[PDB]
Amino acid sequence: STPQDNANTVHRYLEFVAKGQPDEIAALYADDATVEDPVGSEVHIGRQAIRGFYGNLENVQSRTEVKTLRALGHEVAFYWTLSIGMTMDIISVMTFNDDGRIKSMKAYWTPENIT
């Protein structure tokens, strides 16, 4: 996949986060993808575990905003906000397989980053 493809996929991801759609989110990930959210916590391995993880937002309407996004090589680093009044500003890095699905996600945030 190209960096443009991968940027588009990140926008998809944030769309489905905003709409509270964990099935759509999980479908963006590869079969043996990893999610580490937050960095430092136990990694979630495989789409089944990843789909379970994203139950934390099913039917949760929110708003997302990309502050800056850099699609380089097979990676995308993006700094963004999640608003559920309460707002989280998050630094995320995703990497992508050859087919364009997400191979890994890492999220860098703490409650210090909640307003």
Add this chain to the structure above:
Amino acid sequence: STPQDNANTVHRYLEFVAKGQPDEIAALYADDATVEDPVGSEVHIGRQAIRGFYGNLENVQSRTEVKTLRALGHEVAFYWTLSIGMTMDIISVMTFNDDGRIKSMKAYWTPENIT
């Protein structure tokens, strides 16, 4: 090392960058560390190659400023500005070995991020 110490190492690094001390920068890296700057370019592997990479960049007086820094597990993600009337905003990720040396650095930026 602790996330606190790793955050401190990031600050040491940024001031060696500002003060043009490439051998002090290389000393912060592990002997088999990697630098990928920018992400997508050929990785520099080993402290010897890393020393050459920064030694190219030395004695330049620049200014560095952290906008936000998240030290989590054995990683630090930080969004910062490098001022050379040129300034650019960079998303960087460092990871650290048990002894606190930098194991890996990745820098996410392009010339689009130069103002």
